[PDB]
Amino acid sequence: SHMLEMIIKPRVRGFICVTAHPTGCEANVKKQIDYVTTEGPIANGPKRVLVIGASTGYGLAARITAAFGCGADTLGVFFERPGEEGKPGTSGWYNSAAFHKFAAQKGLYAKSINGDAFSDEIKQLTIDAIKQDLGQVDQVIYSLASPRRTHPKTGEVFNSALKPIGNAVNLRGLDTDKEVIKESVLQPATQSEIDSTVAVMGGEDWQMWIDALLDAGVLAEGAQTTAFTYLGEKITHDIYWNGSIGAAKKDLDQKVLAIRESLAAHGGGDARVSVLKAVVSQASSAIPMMPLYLSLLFKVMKEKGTHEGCIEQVYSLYKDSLCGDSPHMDQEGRLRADYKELDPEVQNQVQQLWDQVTNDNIYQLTDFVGYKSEFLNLFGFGIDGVDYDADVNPDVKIPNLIQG
Ligand SMILES: NC(=O)C1=CN([C@@H]2O[C@H](COP(=O)(O)OP(=O)(O)OC[C@H]3O[C@@H](n4cnc5c(N)ncnc54)[C@H](O)[C@@H]3O)[C@@H](O)[C@H]2O)C=CC1
Numbered sequence: 001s002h003m004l005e006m007i008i009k010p011r012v013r014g015f016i017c018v019t020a021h022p023t024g025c026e027a028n029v030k031k032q033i034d035y036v037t038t039e040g041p042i043a044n045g046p047k048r049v050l051v052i053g054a055s056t057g058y059g060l061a062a063r064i065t066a067a068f069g070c071g072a073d074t075l076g077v078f079f080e081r082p083g084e085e086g087k088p089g090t091s092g093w094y095n096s097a098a099f100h101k102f103a104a105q106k107g108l109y110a111k112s113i114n115g116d117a118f119s120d121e122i123k124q125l126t127i128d129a130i131k132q133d134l135g136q137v138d139q140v141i142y143s144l145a146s147p148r149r150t151h152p153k154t155g156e157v158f159n160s161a162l163k164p165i166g167n168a169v170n171l172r173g174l175d176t177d178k179e180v181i182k183e184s185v186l187q188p189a190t191q192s193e194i195d196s197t198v199a200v201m202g203g204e205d206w207q208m209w210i211d212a213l214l215d216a217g218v219l220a221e222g223a224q225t226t227a228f229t230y231l232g233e234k235i236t237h238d239i240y241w242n243g244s245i246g247a248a249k250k251d252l253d254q255k256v257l258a259i260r261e262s263l264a265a266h267g268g269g270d271a272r273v274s275v276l277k278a279v280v281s282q283a284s285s286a287i288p289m290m291p292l293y294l295s296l297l298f299k300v301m302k303e304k305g306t307h308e309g310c311i312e313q314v315y316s317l318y319k320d321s322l323c324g325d326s327p328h329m330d331q332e333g334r335l336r337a338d339y340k341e342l343d344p345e346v347q348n349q350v351q352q353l354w355d356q357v358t359n360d361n362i363y364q365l366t367d368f369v370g371y372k373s374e375f376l377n378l379f380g381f382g383i384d385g386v387d388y389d390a391d392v393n394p395d396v397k398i399p400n401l402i403q404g
């Protein structure tokens, strides 16, 4: 039995943790659930929810909130690697296995579709699941983060870029492997890289989902859809909001209008771009600026009593703005959950510390310790009450998983 089981430890390759611990991921999911149930139910939420990008990060938190906060049946869509003998699956795989297990315990419906959400086939498999099981869905959460997209009509592979626009930028960062504060210069994106990034992370595919669901008659009256976005502090603007990724996020703002239009005539449904705060995610070491920014932001926010991760953010997004009597709206019609990160005093303190951090004062000036812990937590490592010495079977199976 030892031959099919293994001891799983973190292994980090090229800033990527390439292992995930099944028991730890389960404890992580359970902790997020217990948060939602500890805070209490959310009134007037959707009862039948499709989450696109449902296995990790913000879409996972949306699934947990909808299910265990609003009592929803949830259909999740993601792209994850199952575990096998000697070869741990991805954290999102284990997270969803744990979700299905906890949902079934509470008597809630949980079905998932593993495959490319950008494809027509997966959209068709999703429609079929809704038709067979749910009739219609009341809410569609759009929470994909992807480096690439295969266009479903032309077959063209688009690659997203994380580059400024216009001028090259000098970005201070933290290299999490060598633990050094260091700067690098990123060249500006070509028009082609900008359009490719808009193709991947813009709002076309969100549009195609909502249209396909409508064309099939699977969206309830008064339905609702939201796609997640980030605006960030002024310090992130050159690389994010005003870079190639920001061009994609701005495309979301041009898509959301024809979406709200569609659903508002449809029983007064609604659509909103939802703005969330920066958190540690699987990609956080995409660019070394993110670990440094998060390390600083965590420290400053912890001092103010305002630090949160995915579950806290999305719980109050549902409670205050998606289902709540007083939505927190901006001037563009976006829903905002990110205001504690953007508070002037937080930005100012983050900025003052930014020009002071060196290799020697990282632990005195920042919550790098907290960054590292949350990063390991994502993959099911460093969690309380988990025995990391016990053998585990990496081949964890999921009931009602449609493999696309
Ligand atoms: N991470 C952050 O600090 C912030 C993220 N957001 C936005 O939130 C959204 C969610 O991102 P995170 O939670 O960070 O990402 P994540 O990496 O944790 O989750 C991405 C989800 O997309 C799924 N996925 C990726 N490619 C897919 C494909 N081709 N087909 C089906 N599923 C696919 C993954 O399986 C996963 O369930 C993105 O729109 C992101 O820009 C908003 C503000 C801040």
Ligand SMILES: CCCCCCc1ccn(Cc2ccccc2Cl)c(=O)c1
Binding pocket: 144, 145, 146, 162, 201, 229, 230, 232, 236, 240, 245, 277, 278, 279, 281, 283, 286, 289, 290, 293
């Ligand atoms: C300096 C820190 C800037 C970003 C912090 C917030 C954040 C984190 C992750 N993501 C996801 C993401 C980020 C960059 C490129 C592609 C993708 Cl999908 C976001 O969209 C936003």
Ligand code: NA
Binding pocket: 053, 054, 055, 056, 057, 058, 059, 060, 143, 144, 145
């Ligand atoms: Na997500």
